[PDB]
Amino acid sequence: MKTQVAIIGAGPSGLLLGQLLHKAGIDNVILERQTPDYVLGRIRAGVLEQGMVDLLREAGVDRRMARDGLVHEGVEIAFAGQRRRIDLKRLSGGKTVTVYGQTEVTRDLMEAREACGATTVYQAAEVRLHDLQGERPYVTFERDGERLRLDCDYIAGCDGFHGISRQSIPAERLKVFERVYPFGWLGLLADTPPVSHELIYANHPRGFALCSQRSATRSRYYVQVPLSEKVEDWSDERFWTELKARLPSEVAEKLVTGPSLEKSIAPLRSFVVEPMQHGRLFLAGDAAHIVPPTGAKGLNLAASDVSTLYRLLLKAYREGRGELLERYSAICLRRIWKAERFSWWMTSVLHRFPDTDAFSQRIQQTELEYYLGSEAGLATIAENYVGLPYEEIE
């Protein structure tokens, strides 16, 4: 079996990269460990930046999003009994964010790939990478018992945080930067109309809470919870009671509750590896870095890695400029670090930490009061939230 670019992982990163590549005439094969249905069952991202929206249009898979996605011009932050709106559109110079579920984006890409007839192997078991530094690397996997070999020119690891690609790079060649937060997010998806037309991030003494949405009739809520928690300890009603307690009274009053469609706990983490490549293997998305969800950057950062990888591969194949691929990591890491900094800042100002002294609690409150009350402060939040510009390359 032979292709030009082997892609490990059929989550949004691998699918978007494969679609862009296919449209440009660069043959590619995607290998996924799970089934199509499993990938589709993952409830994740809800907020997309402009850059991600444009990339989807470039890949020609934006029809449904343009029709169903909600365009938001602001977000709200509640703390110490007050709600402050950040006018993203005004303060960022006209940019906005789009609410369109990750399951939707994934469905759209999967449908697009199937129609094009591009190769996707689901349930590709025990994927292994070989000859990463050679001229001709290859991937071995198992499909119903028999070990098959796939030859390629380049391999893009889009297999997420627990994928095989990052583990395939000699450990000594990588520098890992990581921070684990002492809390996670308990999320609940409900078929109820959202409590607000815009998102509400709330810093409350009992802990962080976030009111989000998926459509006019589907909502997504999260509450900060310690790492000791098990999802089975949280009935739907306990969640609603806890959520209501962390929100301002006028918001909790008009809250329409209902049975959960999905409920899960996501641990918060910051993680970055340098470099993001090794020989003919290039990491993209969650395979290379993780951000705590507070800044809604994860999927958006994956889009820029992919945008960068696609452009460089195009240069390599169409223009014979293969040397440009060495700049991949330098280019991506500039954007990754700034988004990591923003996500870390958002996280530290909105969550309640366990070992916090009086001075720190006051500084946290003051950070909010300052940034939400200063035009310059508001602009730093807004420009970061809508997404910093992509680097053009060369």
**What does R_g of the chain's alpha carbons equal in angstroms?**
21
Is residue 51 within 8 A of residue 304, CB to CB? The reply is yes
365 known member of a binding site: no
Q: How far is the CB of 291 from a copy of itself (least distance, A)?
A: 12
User: What does 340 bind: Br ion, a copy of itself, ligand FAD, none (CB cut-off 5 to 8 Å by kind)?
Assistant: a copy of itself
Q: Which of residues 260-299 bind ligand FAD (CB under 6 A)?
A: 266, 285-286, 293, 296-299
User: What does 11 bind: a copy of itself, ligand FAD, Br ion, none (CB cut-off 5 to 8 Å by kind)?
Assistant: ligand FAD
User: What does 114 bind: Br ion, ligand FAD, a copy of itself, none (CB cut-off 5 to 8 Å by kind)?
Assistant: none
How far is 373 from 353, CA to CA, in rounded Å? 24
385: annotated active-site residue: yes
Categorise residue 273: left if φ over 0, alpha if ψ from -120 to 50, beta otherwise.
beta
User: What does 33 bind: ligand FAD, a copy of itself, Br ion, none (CB cut-off 5 to 8 Å by kind)?
Assistant: ligand FAD
Is residue 129 within 8 A of residue 139, CB to CB? The reply is yes
User: What does 379 bind: Br ion, a copy of itself, ligand FAD, none (CB cut-off 5 to 8 Å by kind)?
Assistant: a copy of itself
How far is 91 from 362, CA to CA, in rounded Å? 27
Q: Give backbone dihedrals phi and psi of 239, rounded to 5 degrees, phi first.
A: -60, -50
User: What does 337 bind: a copy of itself, Br ion, ligand FAD, none (CB cut-off 5 to 8 Å by kind)?
Assistant: a copy of itself
SS3 state of residue 84: strand
Provide the residue count of the chain: 394
Q: Which of residues 228-247 bind ligand FAD (CB under 6 A)?
A: none
Provide the binding-site residues for a copy of itself, judged by CB under 8 A.
175-179, 270, 272, 337-338, 340-341, 344, 357-360, 362-363, 366-367, 369-370, 374, 376-377, 379-380, 383
How far is 190 from 323, CA to CA, in rounded Å? 49
Q: How far is the CB of 360 from ligand FAD (least distance, A)?
A: 23
364 known member of a binding site: no
CB-based burial label for 159 (10 Å; 0-12, 13-18, 19+) = buried
28 known member of a binding site: no
How far is 99 from 35, CA to CA, in rounded Å? 26
SS3 state of residue 345: helix
207 known member of a binding site: no
297: annotated active-site residue: yes
CB-based burial label for 235 (10 Å; 0-12, 13-18, 19+) = exposed
293 known member of a binding site: yes
Q: Does 69 bind ligand FAD (CB under 6 A)?
A: no
Q: Residue 77's CB: how many other CB atoms inside 10 A?
A: 21
Q: Does 185 bind ligand FAD (CB under 6 A)?
A: yes
Is residue 371 within 8 A of residue 379, CB to CB? The reply is no
For ligand FAD, the binding residue among 158, 255, 339, 382 (CB under 6 A) is 158
89: annotated active-site residue: no
293: annotated active-site residue: yes
* Element containing residue 299 per DSSP (H, E): helix 298-319
Q: What is the DSSP string of 82-126?
A: EEEEEEHHHHTTS--EEE--HHHHHHHHHHHHHHHT-EEETT-EE
SS3 state of residue 380: helix
Q: How far is the CB of 103 from Br ion (least distance, A)?
A: 4
Annotated binding site for FAD: 13, 32, 42-47, 102, 286, 299-300
Please list the active-site residues: 72, 201, 293, 297, 385
Q: Where on the chain is the footprint of ligand FAD (CB under 6 A)?
A: 8-14, 31-34, 39, 44-47, 102, 124, 127, 158-160, 162-164, 185, 187, 266, 285-286, 293, 296-300, 302
Residues tagged in the binding site annotation: 13, 32, 42-47, 102, 201, 212-214, 222, 286, 293, 299-300
Positions at the binding site for substrate: 201, 212-214, 222, 293
